[PDB]
Amino acid sequence: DPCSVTEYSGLATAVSSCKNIVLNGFQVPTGKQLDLSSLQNDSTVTFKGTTTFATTADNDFNPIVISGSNITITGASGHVIDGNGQAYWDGKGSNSNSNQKPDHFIVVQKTTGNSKITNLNIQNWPVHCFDITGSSQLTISGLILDNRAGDKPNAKSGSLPAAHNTDGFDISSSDHVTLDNNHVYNQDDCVAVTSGTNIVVSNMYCSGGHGLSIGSVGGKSDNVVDGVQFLSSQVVNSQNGCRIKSNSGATGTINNVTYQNIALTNISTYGVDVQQDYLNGGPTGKPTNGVKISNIKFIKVTGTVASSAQDWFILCGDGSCSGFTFSGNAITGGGKTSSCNYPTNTCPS
Length: 349
Ligand SMILES: *[C@@H]1O[C@H](CO)[C@@H](O[C@@H]2O[C@H](CO)[C@@H](O)[C@H](O)[C@H]2NC(C)=O)[C@H](O)[C@H]1NC(C)=O
Known about the structure:
Keywords: hydrolase, pectin degradation
Bound molecules: a molecule of 2 linked components (NAG-NAG)
CATH superfamily: Single-stranded right-handed beta-helix, Pectin lyase-like
Number of helices: 1
Largest sheet: 17 strands, parallel
Entry title: Endopolygalacturonase from the phytopathogenic fungus Fusarium moniliforme
Assembly: monomeric
Helix content: under 10%
Name: endopolygalacturonase
PDB class: hydrolase
Strand content: over 45%
Distance between the termini: 63 Å
Radius of gyration: 20 Å
């Protein structure tokens, strides 16, 4: 059965001959990418057994690539997809001057036609997990990203957490993307939308990450975010719950963004963060107004933040923010006075 792949060498043929392909769980040899960019229309790929990856010390290497129209990527019960992160982690993540590691584990580009990815068990990935770009009408649910193994330090990170910059879902230049019922244990942004339209993220279980954050926007290929919805979700043991960041000195657009029904728990620094002073992955303290943020809604954002974090932190640019709505929020716990500068110099406290 050509449609039943037992080894990497049988993948190509399966993708060209079968609309229903079954990966039985093998190891992808070093330097070889699990190429699913040529999937036929209405094709279905099912992950079985344990899929593993050989070690490929290269930043630009992309282990898995998915493309096609009306395609379906799912897994069978008890299946597992290991990214071989333990072999890469050195607690520096995507840092240029660190050990070389695949930046994007899974690249979902050019996926359309009401395609969907569901019920996937992914674990131990290098850096960024999902790189969703140039896709539309796509649905991802029932996903379980577990990178807790990278929480502890190894022989390469010293006292640092092996895993770093392990974004769960990165979305860009996409439209009508829906994320529902997804578990994410990582060390960075649970879900980062640098650009896209009509994006929906609901029933999200983030933990140990940086929370559902927007951006950073600006300075990238695409700096336009219009129509994003974070609904019924839980952010625990994370740096931030709801964060909207923008690169300093850059231009872009962030409109129609709504955080609704978000429960926070044990936030480290920011319960709700909205700043436009990000430079080189770090806050500058001086926000710019190149990126226009408008129509932002914080509805029913409750929960608690660690004593070491601020309930609210809003650092908008000079006249670059407009239309902020706050309703039903109840964030408590912060040991540092909240600070924000829009719409006025007072916050929800
Ligand atoms: C979308 O893709 C699905 C497959 O995932 C298509 O439904 C399969 O189609 C053939 C008929 O052509 C049947 O033999 C199978 O029973 C189908 N499977 C399922 C799960 O339905 C469906 O036709 C596609 N939709 C469009 C609009 O093309």
